[PDB]
Amino acid sequence: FQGAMSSSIDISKINSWNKEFQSDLTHQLATTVLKNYNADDALLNKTRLQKQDNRVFNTVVSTDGRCWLFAATNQLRLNVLSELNLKEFELSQAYLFFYDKLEKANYFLDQIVSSADQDIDSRLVQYLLAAPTEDGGQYSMFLNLVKKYGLIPKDLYGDLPYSTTASRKWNSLLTTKLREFAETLRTALKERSADDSIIVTLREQMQREIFRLMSLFMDIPPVQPNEQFTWEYVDKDKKIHTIKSTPLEFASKYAKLDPSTPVSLINDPRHPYGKLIKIDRLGNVLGGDAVIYLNVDNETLSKLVVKRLQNNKAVFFGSHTPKFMDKKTGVMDIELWNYPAIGYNLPQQKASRIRYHESLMTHAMLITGCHVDETSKLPLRYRVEVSWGKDSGKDGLYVMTQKYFEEYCFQIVVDINELPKELASKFTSGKEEPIVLPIWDPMGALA
Amino acid sequence: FQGAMSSSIDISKINSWNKEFQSDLTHQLATTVLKNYNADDALLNKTRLQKQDNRVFNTVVSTDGRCWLFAATNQLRLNVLSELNLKEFELSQAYLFFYDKLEKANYFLDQIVSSADQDIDSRLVQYLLAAPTEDGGQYSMFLNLVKKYGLIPKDLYGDLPYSTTASRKWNSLLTTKLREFAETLRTALKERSADDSIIVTLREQMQREIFRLMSLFMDIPPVQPNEQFTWEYVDKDKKIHTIKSTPLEFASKYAKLDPSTPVSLINDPRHPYGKLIKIDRLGNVLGGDAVIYLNVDNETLSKLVVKRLQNNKAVFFGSHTPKFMDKKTGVMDIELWNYPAIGYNLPQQKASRIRYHESLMTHAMLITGCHVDETSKLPLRYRVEVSWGKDSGKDGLYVMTQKYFEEYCFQIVVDINELPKELASKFTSGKEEPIVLPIWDPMGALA
Amino acid sequence: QAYLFFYDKLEKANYFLDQIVSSADQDIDSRLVQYLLAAPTEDGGQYSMFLNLVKKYGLIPKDLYGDLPYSTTASRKWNSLLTTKLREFAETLRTALKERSADDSIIVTLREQMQREIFRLMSLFMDIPPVQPNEQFTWEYVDKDKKIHTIKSTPLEFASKYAKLDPSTPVSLINDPRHPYGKLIKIDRLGNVLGGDAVIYLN
């Protein structure tokens, strides 16, 4: 009784506390202002903004929820511009987006069959049923798709369909169907075994029905991965050309993709550095590669970003958007808002923010530059590019502090050749046992 | 030298002061917020708003820059509604507005002739030239017009012309002409005397030219003051009627105006109470009545407002708009904004605010109700009505505190019969010598 | 521009206090005192007032101090709050000058407290610039060719060394037909920095 009493909200206590807080001038000022405006609008610190909104970067690349696909295909887009002397060029994101969604719906049916032994109310089965066709993904999922499907110019398959730019309704219609199929499969698996002719036939009818519904909202791409397409275009000089190629040959011959060089490093302080981290079950293409990260410290993660940028290549990275991100000015700085002035401070550290459900990776973006300090020999800020129209931020360009990178970013993607042999070996040796995390881990899919 | 040095802005001092202010938390909070938002938007105190925005009034009237004319004609408008059993009705403001402007332009020419002895750069002549045709006025100026012109229903002469609702350009064109005429008159008065045939002819040609330019922007009313008009209308029951009347007979017979009963009281602490105050030269109709106020204390001014409201009549009053007036919520309260929380306090008293160019009468409005405290026997707040469309305030309705009335209001208009004999006598006795103030005094014309 | 705008406003508020002390002998309702009280902190100025500020404060690149604050692009409310205070200070000064003389220790202290209070209120709406006129700033920039550079300079050295200002060459000519041509015209009292140059025109 005494415990529950002490643990209850006591009316005299809160009114006494109120009287005490109301006697403080800062508090009186703060509650006047915070009843009138959104705290971020009210506390944005222009004095800090003045110093941090710096768009001078001495280390830049020379060139100029589906974000993960725009960020992932960017370099390949640049390789084509260069290889073909183009003025402008876009790879088709819709191409990858259509197959990702089909594969994910197909993947879910397999996840359901493999988890059929578990109770319908189990944590995994409910988790599988929550959002089987979400638009986000990881870099490994992007490579799984390019290895099977290749890449094609946006001119052959663009963002024309309604659902390519407003996928919410489409996903909901598919998901409702997938939830029905989950029950139908689990129900048929009570009697028959999975290899049973009936389950095999049922799974195929389901693939058919998923494909049929998808074909209503988006067309299947115009050519198969090994089928040739003819593409007419104009180079920087107004000269015309025709390329005959297949999607697969195109990803390699023109976009120069070598799927075996990309590796993802991550700063996840919940785990020891030097270890490989694998997210169980997270995927898109059945039988494709797993999401694997090599865990490293921020110093290491920062040097790698600088080295890649020095090799004139942008860096794919994942972070917690939109934590401490000001879209209006395009600034990512954890001290840009004056919360300490209202006594609001946040001591919880990175590893704990992750464990306690406060911070996770949510979006993928591109680092295209940085500023390394002459004195010292370290990065101070990074130039970041988003896929949110030329209107978000400074014409879509953001500036991010080193501290933001350390605290609210986690993963970067680099080529294994850019790593020190001691780290590259972690991937090639075949001796590392990864730490295996649940499918629902915060270090997952990116928008 | 030491004086000028001590009196200069010293860079070390202001930077030292800055360091001291920046060490205070309230200050740090305040400069963050005040660089982001307008101080009134930021400091509006909703906690105070919650208590002061009270629209319950136990003392209300039973009925339901040209504001001074809408406020001035309102009662007469109600008298007509009642006298004719009308559902809706408006007196024509444009009627009064057209003659006010003509008379004012004519008045200016006379002010110029009477001040011709003074230098062109004198304070009075420059003041006369500043805004000879402004739209604002005083209650005496309103009576000067009704006594000569009468009143007509809005149905016969409405706010149709562009310049009746956007008079800025019209006034500027007239004023430019009037400034030319001022020189032409002063120039002709160097040789000839004012009664000289030539000056008389010149003044008439100027009246003609003013009238001609005015007739381009607004038509002269359709009937003369003693000429009959025919007005067709429908009463509350959908029954039709025709009234044949002249503007003058109409102001008296239907709108029930008796120009000899209205008197204006004012609270001007710069002067002793019990004295009559006259604003020199301020007028519209040449030879009409002067602007005269009987100076009284706030207790007296407040009791008179209550008494008039008890006689079921609204009260014309002048105040300093928009000091401490929140248009969005429709509240007039000098403590509604939390300026003390940023250390901004204003000790300067009423009489001093007036002398030091900080507060003056600027607009005329209507008090249509008030709340007198059961305990005590005094008014707590007033219901105020503005002529700013149903969109300003609470459907055009404001609530004003007793303190606001005391500090930022000055004049009210009442019937001499409502005054205590000791005050009424101040007007009838013929023994009072008014304190005479300059034409540029803050206790002047209202918008 | 905000750099110059912040000091112009501070100096003007400071200037007004001095105009009030020097006109204290005149009646509160006199033409000059009422004129002084009308708009002591208006945003406008003359070229001489601009030179008075550059000579004392110098110039800095907009990248170090921009038009970020609300009041830099909508100064009406800020000016009104300052002006209301300045009108209160005018009375407090004239009232204290009835007894004591201007050099009196009390008037000197009072004037300083007023400067302090003006500066404090201004610092709520705009920050004092990041460096003093003789203090060095570091400025990073990119030239037409995408090459990066860092300039270390003080605001004063910057107005001269990079912006090439020589405050002694600018002169203002005017066509004012009210007066004879060939004459110099001086506008009495019009200024911003106490003791700075007067507004003078050659007609």
The enclosing domain of B67 has a CATH number of 3.90.70.10
C141 close contact with A: CB closer than 8 A: yes
Which residues of chain C does B346 touch, with a Cβ-Cβ cutoff of 8 Å?
84-85, 88
C173 touches chain A (CB under 8 A): no
Backbone angles phi, psi at C14, to 5 degrees: -65, -40
Contact C28 B355 (CB under 8 A): yes
Q: Tell me, what DSSP letter sits at residue B88?
A: S
Is B44 a domain residue? no
Q: Does C140 touch chain A (CB under 8 A)?
A: yes
CA torsion angle A48 A52 A53 A54 (round to 10): 150
The Cα–Cα gap between B411 and B415 comes to: 14
Q: Do B28 and A342 touch (CB under 8 A)?
A: no
Which tokens hold the place of C125? 């709406």
> Quick check: A153 and A89 in contact, CB under 8 A?
yes
Q: Which chains touch A (3 or more CB pairs under 8 A)?
A: B, C
Contact C84 B6 (CB under 8 A): no
Q: What is the resolution of this structure in A?
A: 2.2
Identify the bridge partners of residue C137 per DSSP, sorted by sequence position. C153
* Angle between the N-to-C axes of helices B67-83 and B93-114, in degrees from 0 to 180, rounded to the nearest 10: 140
Residue of C68, C70, C138, C146 to mutate, interface with A, max A Cβ within 10 Å: C68
Helix extents (H) in B85-167:
93-114, 123-130, 139-149, 162-165
- Residue B51 zone, left/alpha/beta (φ > 0; ψ -120 to 50; rest): alpha
The residue of chain C with its CA nearest to that of A58 is C148
Q: Are the Cβ atoms of A46 and C64 closer than 8 angstroms? A: no
CB contact under 8 A, C77 and B38: yes
Tell whether B38 is covered by a domain.
no
Element (H, E) at A409: strand A409-415
CA dist A439 and A399 (Å) reads 32
CB contact under 8 A, A50 and C68: yes
Residue B165, chain C, CB below 8 Å: the answer is: no
Question: What technique solved it?
Answer: X-ray
Are residues C130 and A46, on separate chains, in Cβ contact within 8 Å? no
User: Is residue B31 included in any domain, yes or no?
Assistant: no
Selected residue of B38, B357, B435 to mutate for chain C interface (largest C Cβ count, 10 A): B357
Strand runs labelled E in B180-334: 229-234, 240-245, 262-266, 276-279, 291-295, 315-319, 325-326, 331-332
- The H or E element containing residue A399 is strand A397-401
Q: Are B113 and B195 in contact (CB under 8 A)?
A: no
Residues of C in contact with B325 (CB under 8 A): none
Number of compact structural domains in chain A: 1
Q: For residue A5, tell me if it sits in a domain.
A: no
Tell me whether residue A60 is exposed, middle or buried, using C-beta atoms within 10 angstroms of its C-beta: 0 to 12, 13 to 18, 19 or more.
middle
In 3D space, the residue among A71, A73, A50, A56 whose CA is nearest the CA of residue A383 turns out to be A56
- B139-149 vs B93-114: helix axis angle to the nearest 10? 110
Residue B436: beta bridge partners?
Answer: B278
> Could you give phi then psi for residue C183, rounded to 5 degrees?
-105, 155
Residues in a beta bridge with A365: A317
Contacts of C112 in chain B (CB under 8 A): 6
Q: Quick check: A338 and B32 in contact, CB under 8 A?
A: yes
Q: Which of B28, B37, B43 sits opposite A341 (nearest CB)?
A: B28
Instruction: Return the closest-CA partner of residue A264 out of A136, A72, A431.
Output: A72
Residue A107 in any domain: the answer is: yes
Q: What range does the domain containing B379 cover?
A: 58-447
Query: Which are the contacts of C66, defined by CB distance < 8 A and separation ≥ 6?
Result: A50, C2
Contacts of B44 in chain A (CB under 8 A): 32, 36
* Closest listed residue to residue A102, CA positions, set A18, A187, A183, A218: A218
* Nearest alpha carbon to residue B382 among B405, B361, B364, B414: B405
Q: What is the least distance, in Å, from the CA of B405 to any CA of chain C? A: 20
DSSP state of C44: -
Short-list B285, B273, B284, B263, CA closest to B411: B263
Question: Which residues does chain B have within 8 Å of residue A345's beta carbon, measured at their own beta carbons?
Answer: none
In a domain, B303, yes or no: yes
Closest B-chain CA to C118: B14
CB contact under 8 A, B341 and A46: no
Of B32, B44, B341, the CB nearest to A341: B32
Contacts of C125 in chain B (CB under 8 A): 31, 34-35, 39
* Neighbour count for residue C99 (Cβ, 10 Å): 9
The chain B residue lying nearest C83, using CA atoms, is B358
**Cβ burial, residue A270 (10 Å; 0-12/13-18/19+):** middle
Quick one: how many helices (H) and strands (E) in chain A?
A: 17, 14
Instruction: Please name the residue of chain B whose CA is at the shortest distance from the CA of residue A39.
Output: B33
Place of tokens 């590796």: A263
**Residue C66 with chain A: CB contacts under 8 Å:** 50
Pairing of strands A262-266, A291-295: parallel
Check CB contact of B259 with chain C, cutoff 8 Å. Answer: no
Neighbour count for residue B141 (Cβ, 10 Å): 27
Interface contact B47, partner A, CB < 8 A: yes
Give the helix/strand (H/E) hosting B298. Answer: helix B298-310
Question: Would an 8 Å CB–CB cutoff place B345 in contact with chain C?
Answer: no
Does A44 lie at the interface with B, CB-CB under 8 angstroms?
Answer: yes
CB of C196 within 8 Å of any CB in chain A?
no
State CA A83 to chain mean position distance: 28
In a domain, A50, yes or no: no
A47 — contact with chain C (CB < 8 Å)? yes
3-state helix, strand, coil in chain B (%, to 5): 45, 15, 40
C-chain residue closest to A56, CA distance: C141
Residue B15 lies in a domain: no
